[PDB]
């Protein structure tokens, strides 16, 4: 999945710019650590509702997240 | 309450579907997904995976970028 790889990269990019570890993000998203780790290794098929929990955990605005996603897609 | 992003994703799928002249059944046929899953999405009653969204975008003949532009606009126009 090309789009899953891009969404996963943006997640990681924002997590790392905020200084959060995977455990920090798991906790704030109310998701399991091993699920966050799986997403970032591009090895898990994320839903829209889980994506929203991750955006809330990151405290990133929905519009900003999708602008970043578009930028990353356009690199290709 | 219900997921904001899910309701907006759902709404953009329906909007594009109708702009292309397609029925729910048509979109199911072209996405290779069950018609009852299409219908559930649009009634804001079904979550979907990123990979199902990609199949829907292929059924809609819309690029990822155009889909996300439309999503951004619909989020902005919500108050
Ligand atoms: Na839905």
Residue numbers in the entry:
A (entry chain D): 3 to 78
B (entry chain A): 1 to 79
The authors write:
The most widespread of these mechanisms employs a “controller” (C) protein encoded by a gene downstream of its own promoter, and usually co-transcribed with the endonuclease (R) gene as a single transcriptional unit. The C-protein binds at various sites within the C/R promoter to regulate transcription of its own gene and the associated endonuclease gene. Unusually, in the RM system Esp1396I, the C-protein also represses the MTase (M) gene by binding to the promoter at the transcriptional start site, denoted OM where the C/R genes and the M gene are transcribed convergently from different promoters. Flexibility in this loop is very important for DNA sequence recognition, as it has been observed in the nucleoprotein structures to adopt different conformations depending on which operator site the protein is bound to.
